[model samples]
Target: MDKQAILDNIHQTWQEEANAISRLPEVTSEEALVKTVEKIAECTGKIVVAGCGTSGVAAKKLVHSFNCIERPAVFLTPSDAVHGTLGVLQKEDILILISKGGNTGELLNLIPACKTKGSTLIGVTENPDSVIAKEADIFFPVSVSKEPDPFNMLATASTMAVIASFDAVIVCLMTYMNYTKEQFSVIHPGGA
Candidate 1:
């Protein structure tokens, strides 16, 4: 493709990605978002987030957002969570799993483990009818109708869609808690 064609291609992707985020309200209602963030705020132990592939990447970013907001959190890998990391859970903790399909086998596998630890389960997925969504104490339905890349197989807009949803949750948490720059600086004083 020529320079103008390539430029327009990138612009199209940017627009599509933004559109995906803007479509969040259609999948989730204000009441659901409020309930989800409220459940998050009630947890004093920690927030354990997990996922597979690109969803895992988004989950990790959610962990960082949680930590930045003074909410302790961790990203549990699908492998270690079942192996050694199952011990990371505590009775008061909450487990959040982000899966595009909401029926990921590995995430489904961890559901039982989380239950054994007495933690509340939260699921974020495109499919509201998925097993995780049905089983979760709180759920957020979100998705991009199509991936931004040509193949629609690369984890582009799908992942961004989830990330954008969690970013909304993060802001809600911050606003609800009266978050401030001073509080943030306390936990993040190492930067130059």
Candidate 2:
């Protein structure tokens, strides 16, 4: 294999991912998210996150973080949620959907159902112009690219950046809710 070529490719992809993430504006919807968190804290409903493939894994990680913070959140497989698991949601609940392209069929299929259920829809995707973002009540742009590989590429840098974005969102959520570590530890006895 061409070692120099491989190194160049990885560097180029990292640059692309970094640029994409940097283009996003600092999250300014604190008021809206504050309202969302307040609704979550007061309502006896769950927070559902949906995604597929790598994005799904990222969503699962986010669910763990949310649980640690005692947010009553969980990840719902796009395939499962589209196929009747939508019933797990109620009007008072929130749905956060993650996708890099934001047009995955599995996620798209749940849009109408989520809307009909009257749940709050938040889309997290790299593409601000995507259908998912257009339909979302609040949308966050992850701003990472698929990269240089021919077959849609590997998710190395993009995944890390996306996870960082997810963490940023969670931090913002916690700040808006005025959450304390003491309160967080009540739900995160196992965490650092």
Candidate 3:
């Protein structure tokens, strides 16, 4: 294994991942994206983000980003949401589930409970026809052409795509609400 060759390949894969992220807006439905943003903006209760595996990590980042921007948001694992955290959800809350495959069983299991609590459920997934996607009140697509890895098993590109899509939504919400730099600074005082 030549070191330079490995570096070159890694750079190529990075480019591939970047390209996949660039294609996210094109693959997503504009109408659904708007509706998803509106739902979050209008929610009277906290916006809860949940997921499993890599998607779970993305969900937590998204929640942190939202919180930094003054939005009432939190991240909950699907397992915890079912066990006890479900009690934290209110009728007017919004639950955003992130699953690249859209078939994560733990996430799917929480759907009924969310509905019973009268919370609006939104899904961010690659498969629009997946059970979670079909059951969600609004489905936001985050499909990627392929992973950057040779095996296509690791979630490098797909995770980037999901995070990028969610960030776009967050930006749109900020613009819609007229979020200001001063307000952002209030939450994030430790600047550059």
Candidate 4:
């Protein structure tokens, strides 16, 4: 194919991704978002984020963001959590599971363990009716209209939506906690 055609396809892919990200605010609920943030902020224990595949990547970012602000947080794959990584969890802790489809097997398998540990479970997914969504103590829906790829098979848009939603939560939490530039710089002193 022509190089120009490839460039055009790339542009279209980015355009689709932007469109999907822009629609995130519409899918989110302000009240639920605030409540979720409050639950996380008030947690007497660490925030454990778990997911699979691309969802895992987003979950890791959420963990990083929370830690950067001095909050106790960590990333654990559902597979590892079940195998013993979940030992970090405590009754006052919160588990935030990320999944675009919301039916990932490993993540689904985590529900029973989370409940038995008495940890509050939160689900971030594209499907509100998914098994994890229903089982979660709280659910945040971040669905997109379509993927950026022509075939709608790749995770481009869905991942973008999830990250965007997570970023929104992080920003709100920062403001709620009165996080300052000085405090941020202390944690990220190498950057502007």
Candidate 5:
């Protein structure tokens, strides 16, 4: 086995994923971010987040992130939503959906239901012209150049971009509210 060659591939993957995160600022703006934060902060109802597959996992991470700062959030499985879990949506709530193609059938299916519930829509997607983007009341791009794997079709770089975008939004929200360790202490008694 060529140790040096294997090591080089590992290093290359790290750099590629980091580059994907570095491109977020080019696709999103400060004004849009501030508006998103304001909407969530003012919401009188729950925050519902959803996605499918790996995106669904990322959505769950975002929910925990908001909860850490004392802003309550819950995850909705698109599959379960269609099976009656969507009843959790309320007129005053906000639904944040994540999809790279922005055209995931399940995520799109939730739109009409969101409308019916009179809740607001937010999306994080790679395609700005996709259906979810068009339907979203607000959204931001989270595209990646390409996956680092040889096929360039895996969700590797794309998934990292999504996670990093959530990280950015969470940090932005923390600063927006002037979230402090003192207040955090009251909510989380575990890890930071």
Candidate 6:
């Protein structure tokens, strides 16, 4: 195995993903994307994020941005939800489900229950045509490469894409909501 080549590939992939994210277009009024953020912010209940594997890890980190901005948010693993944690969901909650291809089996399994509970479902995915994206009220398309070169290796680019896409949305949401640093500090007392 060419270790240096692998490292170089990973590094280049990260840089490319970062640049790609920076180049993403803003969510315009015509897209109706702002409505999702506004509705969630206006809702009294918390924001819940659900995902599996690497996507789940990305969701967990993304939820922190919401918390930092004074938006109540929490992480709910799709795998654990069916095991009983799904009860944590409330009727007024907003759910942001993350799946690279948007077809995660566990996420799909929990969607109907979430819907029945009256949760607003949103999906973050790379594939717009995926089932989760199709069913979601709002869809954020990450749309990074599915696989790296020759070895068909780890999630390097895909994971970074997910993280970058999520971060972009969080920044947009924070700015659009006019969330001030003072308000963010209130939620992040430790950072103060």
Best by lDDT: 1
Question: Which residue pairs in model 2 clash with each other?
Answer: none
lDDT string, candidate 6, 1-192, tens digits: 499988997887667666655544532122535666677668688889988778888888878877877778999977689999989889989888888778889899988888889888888776778998899888766654334545645565666766766565677777777888788666667742
Question: Each candidate's TM vs. the true structure?
Answer: 0.94, 0.74, 0.93, 0.93, 0.92, 0.82
Give the better candidate number (4 or 6) by TM-score. Answer: 4
lDDT of all predictions? 0.87, 0.74, 0.85, 0.85, 0.86, 0.75
Lowest lDDT block of 10, candidate 6: 23-32
How do the residues 1-192 of candidate 5 rate in per-residue lDDT, one tens digit apiece? 499999999999999998888887876656767788898778888789999888888899889988888688999998899999999999999899999899999999999999888899998898889998889888767788868999877788888888887787778788887889998988878774
For model 2, residues 1-192, the per-residue Cα lDDT tens digits are 599998988788777767656644553245544554565556467789888888888889888887766778878877677667888878878888888788988888888988889998888776778989899987766554445455656665566666776676677767776889799767656745
Off by over 4 Å in 6: 1-11, 26-32, 146-150
Error of 2 at 48 (Å): 0.6
Q: lDDT tens digits, residues 42-104, model 4?
A: 877889999888888888988998898768898987767878887887898889999888899
lDDT (tens digit, per residue) of candidate 3 on 66-155: 887678898887878778987777888888889888889998888888888889988889898898789988988878886878788889
Q: lDDT ranking from best to worst?
A: 1, 5, 3, 4, 6, 2
- Stretches off by above 4 angstroms in model 1 are none
Off by over 4 Å in 3: none
Query: Candidate 4: where are CA atoms >4 Å away?
Result: none
Q: Give the better candidate number (4 or 6) by lDDT.
A: 4
What tens-digit string does per-residue lDDT give for candidate 1 at 1-192? 999999999999999888888888876667768887898887789999999999999999999999999999999999887788888988899888998889999999988877777899888887888999898888777777867798888868888888888899899899898889999989988968
Q: Against the true structure, candidate 4 has what lDDT?
A: 0.85
CA deviation > 4 Å runs, candidate 2 = 1-44, 145-152
Clashes of each: 0, 0, 0, 0, 0, 1
